[PDB]
Design a protein around this ligand. Sequence first.
Ligand SMILES: [Cl-]
Ligand code: NA
Length: 265
Amino acid sequence: TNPYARGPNPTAASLEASAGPFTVRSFTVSRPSGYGAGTVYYPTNAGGTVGAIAIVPGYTARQSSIKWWGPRLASHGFVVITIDTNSTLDQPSSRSSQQMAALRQVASLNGTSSSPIYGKVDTARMGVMGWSMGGGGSLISAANNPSLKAAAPQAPWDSSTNFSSVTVPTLIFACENDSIAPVNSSALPIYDSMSRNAKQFLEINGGSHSCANSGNSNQALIGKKGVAWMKRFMDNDTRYSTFACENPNSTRVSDFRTANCSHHH
Ligand SMILES: [Cl-]
Ligand code: NA
């Protein structure tokens, strides 16, 4: 029935695993348009067109900090682009423009016969993710582009915490012990500002600012949640509603909040 549903019915184990059902390949963007550099991860055997997600790092950071998401998401049926910004010192508004530029390029590559992703993307179904300033940029992207299907920033920061205009379903990963972008002044005020969307707050117990980055020790949970969120909202895949909306009730989570996530008859 759902034309966007891909892959086998999910389980907790399947979502917690390092890899999803699909085989993944990647390429580096040869001529980046509007951003510094990019790597595109894609499924080779999805069975249908899939949505696209663009991920941006934090200040001073590069693709390495967020690269784990690429294969993790692509393996579940997404085309994911991780970027390096024009400057490592770019601010959130710039990061947002660059993130959108990356999504635009994925759309262009979907239409380029020589590309590995030719015809593999449903350009009408897109998502945004990012770390810190990149997370704030993801939120800026969502505010400015309400046709985006999902947002899942991690340890987000922006100069303004008021994201009241966001109508995109948004999952905020936070880190309890963050000293760069403290939860109390950053992630949580941002979460609280949003009253018009499906939203979720997931704080990792004892986490530093890099708690959701490559090499984190909570990939099973974090990966499960991120994929579930994207599946539920990018693909409208209600097979993932419990996973997306549930409170994990895990020692790894120190603070869980959610609103407007579950469907009511
Ligand atoms: Cl920290
Ligand atoms: Na460029």
